[PDB]
């Protein structure tokens, strides 16, 4: 009931576009505003200084690429203050195919501070024409049967990839390195059995660095049969750690898979030693096999991944959404698995990821856009959850609930919540709420902003966590009379803005005339079904539009007021202050 509308402040840069204010984020010393581009303009982040009233564009140093999508995804970790910005606009061509994935930036300290970047769910381009090099271990540590099973794997791979545009070469390495056959030697025979006829076990050390450098400089050459218009691919097979040191910088341009095999890679610490020889993410390009007989089962994984109609990660649109909790980041990948969707569990340095999708993969989950939303639901005594909406599922939409890996375990899918109205975008906005601040997140708020009927547009449903799962207990009711107003497009927990110790919630309805924001105070037992305040956009600014498209509020500690709330709009970003009054 108490947000001082009369003292509203508006922010806007002189060159701002319409989608300035698409995402607002309050980090002490001001506001972060996302500004995805429009037309041929690129996207940008804006640091808005609290005192100056000036919003300034953020320069990403070391950023090699920036698209129209920058500022479409903004998130922050309340536990450690980190800021994650993503750019789901990394588009490239692979033959006649276009790929679409994201580029995510993490600001551990602030925007002015050190930046990390990675490419979640990024598929390297394997063209139709590939020059593949086998680099296999000939070390003294290999039993003559194991070394044989390594040659059998190389032959079986080439046997599978005859009658393709793949051309092969093989190099044994130990202490030194020997080309067993060149690319032209594969052109003149296509005989994996007669090419390896002359190979002899070297029975010496394992020098991987010099071996990879050997393959970079000496093996990929035109006079040796290497097509310059072809994708370079290197497959390393080794049974132990490397006996030299250095760098493979000369081989950076090459796609590198590496296969560690056997007892020498039982410890996780020895597995991570292989990471530096291979490409990123390590989860994709590093294969650890505990036995040598598992080289035969491996064909499905390592033949297949190396004019599509069916897609895996090529059009993943990774990073179209994010959430951060307790040093753990997830980004959603709506385009994964033929737009079935899913999310990516990111390594803290953004150099590796893990994809979690629908299970099972049915025709019904396709084009569902799972991962359009992602929200952490942490708790201390109860297990922490991740809710992800698939707002397009069966044209109605649904929300899936995933449980953090427990003990040794992996992610499990623990509940499904289906929508009942087509095109309603049920699950297009999610918000976790912990009303009374006990460290346990009891409430899952689900938006259906395109819900139609009964003379009000959009709905917000309230689900409470029970022993079995999340139960629908209530609904946040917005005012009727705006059947297309998109009530529920934005839902955020506001901290506590009336000083009663109970967390309050704001809901944006950006299409109700020129936009509105509903404040819902927290009560004992849940949230108040009825709003205590409705802020029209027309009050704050005369020409304003889409007021409430994005909301973020925090207890701010420099300045007068209980809490500060930043509400985005068309070309505008607005700050409101909570007051005891």
């Amino acid at each position: 009931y108490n947000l001082d509308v009369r003292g509203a402040r508006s922010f806007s840069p002189p060159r701002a576009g319409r989608h300035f204010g698409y995402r607002v984020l309050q980090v002490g010393n001001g506001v972060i505003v996302g500004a995805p581009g429009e037309g041929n303009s690129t996207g940008s982040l804006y640091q808005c200084q609290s005192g100056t009233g000036h919003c300034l564009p953020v320069t990403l140093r070391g950023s090699n690429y920036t698209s129209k999508y920058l500022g479409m995804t903004l998130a922050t970790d309340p536990t450690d203050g980190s800021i994650l910005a993503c750019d789901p606009g990394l588009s490239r061509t692979c033959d006649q195919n276009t790929y679409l994935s994201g580029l995510c930036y993490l600001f551990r300290q602030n925007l002015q501070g050190p930046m990390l970047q990675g490419r979640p769910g990024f598929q390297e381009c394997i063209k139709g024409n590939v020059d593949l090099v086998f680099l296999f271990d000939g070390s003294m540590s290999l039993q003559p049967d194991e070394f044989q099973k390594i040659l059998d794997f190389m032959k079986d791979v080439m046997k599978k990839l005859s009658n393709t545009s793949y051309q092969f070469a093989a190099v044994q390495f130990s202490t030194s390195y020997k080309t067993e056959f060149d690319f032209s030697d594969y052109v003149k025979w296509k005989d994996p059995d007669a090419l390896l006829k002359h190979v002899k076990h070297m029975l010496l050390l394992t020098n991987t660095f010099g071996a990879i450098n050997y393959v970079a400089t000496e093996v990929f050459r035109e006079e040796l049969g290497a097509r310059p218009d072809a994708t370079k691919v290197l497959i390393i097979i080794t049974d132990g750690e490397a006996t030299d040191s250095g760098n493979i910088d000369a081989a950076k341009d090459i796609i590198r898979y590496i296969i560690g095999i056997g007892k020498h890679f039982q410890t996780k610490e020895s597995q991570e030693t292989l990471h530096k020889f291979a490409s990123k993410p390590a989860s994709e390009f590093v294969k650890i096999l505990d036995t040598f007989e598992k080289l035969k089962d491996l064909f499905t994984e390592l033949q297949k991944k190396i004019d599509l109609t069916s897609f895996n990660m090529e059009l993943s649109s990774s990073g179209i959404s994010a959430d951060l909790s307790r040093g753990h980041a997830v980004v959603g990948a709506v385009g994964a698995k033929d737009w079935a969707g899913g999310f990516l569990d990111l390594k803290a340095d953004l150099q590796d990821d893990t994809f979690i999708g629908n299970e099972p993969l049915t025709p019904e989950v396709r084009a569902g856009y799972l991962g359009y939303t992602v929200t952490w639901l942490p708790s201390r005594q109860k297990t922490s959850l991740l809710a992800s909406g698939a707002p397009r599922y069966q044209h109605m939409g649904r929300v899936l609930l995933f449980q953090e890996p427990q003990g040794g375990g992996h992610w499990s899918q623990v509940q499904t919540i289906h929508g009942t109205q087509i095109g309603s975008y049920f699950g297009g906005e999610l918000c976790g709420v912990d009303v009374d601040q006990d460290g346990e997140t009891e409430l899952l708020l689900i938006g259906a902003p395109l819900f139609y009927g009964e003379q009000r547009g959009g709905r917000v449903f309230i689900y409470q966590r029970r022993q079995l799962g999340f139960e629908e207990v209530s609904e946040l009711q917005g005012d009727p009379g705006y059947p297309l107003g998109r009530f529920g497009e934005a839902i955020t927990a506001l901290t506590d803005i009336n000083g009663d110790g109970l967390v309050d919630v704001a809901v944006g309805a950006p299409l109700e005339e020129q936009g509105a924001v509903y404040i819902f105070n927290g009560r004992h037992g849940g949230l108040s079904p009825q709003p205590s305040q409705r802020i029209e956009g027309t009050q704050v600014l005369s020409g304003i539009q889409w007021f409430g498209r994005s909301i973020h509020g925090v207890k701010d500690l420099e300045g007068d007021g209980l809490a500060d709330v930043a509400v985005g709009a068309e070309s505008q970003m607005i700050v409101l202050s909570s007051r005891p009054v």
Binding site: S67, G335, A367, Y372, S424
Partner: protein, 454 residues
């Protein structure tokens, strides 16, 4: 049967108090010690106090109607006492069919190549089917694929020239919406124009059909709608995009529901996000356009759900080659026309309206927010009973009652009954005492001292 009074000082404030309160106009119903709030109570409580039957003022809500027509009556005047409904009857007599404008909006993605071959030859059969239903129909044609940004289409320059598989010779670049043919009663005009069109393609499965329908409904002069029956035939073998999906293409601006046709193309389609389903439902009901979804077997149960939202809509199972579409359109006109919806425009929170639906097929609904009848036959009447209730003393107001799919309306003038309408202009006509006149057994003196007995 019960009356709570608070402020009462007059016959009007009595009726305003509650729907069970009544007023006694008898001269001298008040003893000297008592105030005159005592003239207002429940009718049994008044009879208890010596008031006669004739002297009790019990205004009831009233419905006065002004009136072969399809929808009658045409004007209604209501007098609404707070808390008491008024009941008037609306009769619907289904007329012999209007002329039919039918716009054919076709999915031109590659799986529809065999579909497109048949449809280029179907213009003759279409007009025949329209003229078999009624008199003097027209037909039109438009085509869609999807927006031309990633990942909705492939933006690689070669695949923009040939979105079809590379074997295809006759293939056209992807496009949002092309308006092919204005509404015409000439088949050969349909044949030459629709025959010029080529197949196309796109990338991800759903398609921008809802963009195209929004353009068809927002450009009535370009499509060439008459003010007759309007059918929009939606033929596709895939699902559909709606609002929120544009985010994958970095399209964040909502659909404005305005006509953006240039050169018979929707060129600004990459600027505006897809429309929401409800946004389309709103636009189709405004312009009285009735969509018919002709979808393949795998899309039927999905597009069936659309009929829960869009009241005047129909779904039919399209063959893989779109051959049965002519029998599909007839079956759909039958499904659309045999069901009737009686709704009212937006209302204030002060007024409440319900509909009793008395249907000819032998089914009766009561006290519903909307009148609903099915099994409606030509010239076989059906009756809707409308009950309007006011919560308070109302300001003068008017609303309309529409038969969905038709422009014929019932204009309802709502007037309050807060005044009592009493008696005895005359007889003796003898009195107040001081200069000042009578109203309802209690004097209301002329200004100039005032007080009571005068």
């Amino acid at each position: 049967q019960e009356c709570t009074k608070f402020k009462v000082s007059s016959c009007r404030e009595c009726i305003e108090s509650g729907p069970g309160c009544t007023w006694c106009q008898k001269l001298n119903f008040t003893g000297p010690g008592d105030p005159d709030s005592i003239r207002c109570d429940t009718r049994p409580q008044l009879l208890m106090r010596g008031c006669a039957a004739d002297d009790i003022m019990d205004p009831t809500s009233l419905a006065e109607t002004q009136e072969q027509k399809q929808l009658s009556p045409q004007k209604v005047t209501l007098y609404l006492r707070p808390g008491q409904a008024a009941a008037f009857n609306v009769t619907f007599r289904r007329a012999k069919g209007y002329p039919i404008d039918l716009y054919y909006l076709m999915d031109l993605s590659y799986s529809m190549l065999d579909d497109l071959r048949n449809v280029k030859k179907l213009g003759g059969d279409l007009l025949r089917a329209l003229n078999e239903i009624t008199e003097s129909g027209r037909i039109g044609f438009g085509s869609f694929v999807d927006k031309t940004v990633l990942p909705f289409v492939n933006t690689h320059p070669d695949k923009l020239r040939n979105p079809c598989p590379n074997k295809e010779k006759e293939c056209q670049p992807p496009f949002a919406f092309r308006h092919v043919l204005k509404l015409t009663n000439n088949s050969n005009q349909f044949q030459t124009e629709v025959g010029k069109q080529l197949i196309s393609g796109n990338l991800d499965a759903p398609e921008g059909g809802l963009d195209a329908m929004m353009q068809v409904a927002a450009c009535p002069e370009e499509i060439g709608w008459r003010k007759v029956t309007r059918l929009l035939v939606f033929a596709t073998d895939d699902g559909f995009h709606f609002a929120g999906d544009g985010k994958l293409g970095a399209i964040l601006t909502p659909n404005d529901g305005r006509c953006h046709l240039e050169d018979n193309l929707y060129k600004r389609s990459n600027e505006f996000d897809y429309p929401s389903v409800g946004q389309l439902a709103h636009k189709l009901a405004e312009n009285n356009i009735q969509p018919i979804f002709a979808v393949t077997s795998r899309m039927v149960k999905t597009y069936e759900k659309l009929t829960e939202i869009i009241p005047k809509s129909a779904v039919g199972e399209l063959s893989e080659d779109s051959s049965n579409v002519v029998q599909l359109i007839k079956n759909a006109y039958n499904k659309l026309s045999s069901r009737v919806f009686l709704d009212h425009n937006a209302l204030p929170d002060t007024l409440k309206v319900t509909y009793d639906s008395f249907c000819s097929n032998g089914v009766t609904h009561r006290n519903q927010p909307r009148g609903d009848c099915d099994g409606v036959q030509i010239n076989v009447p059906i009756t809707f009973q409308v009950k309007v209730t006011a919560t308070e003393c109302i300001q003068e107001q008017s609303f309309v009652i529409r038969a969905l799919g038709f422009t014929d309306i019932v204009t309802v003038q709502v007037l309050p009954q807060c005044e009592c309408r009493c008696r005895d202009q005359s007889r003796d006509r003898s009195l107040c005492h001081g200069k000042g006149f009578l109203e309802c057994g209690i004097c209301r003196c002329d200004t100039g001292y005032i007080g009571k007995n005068c």
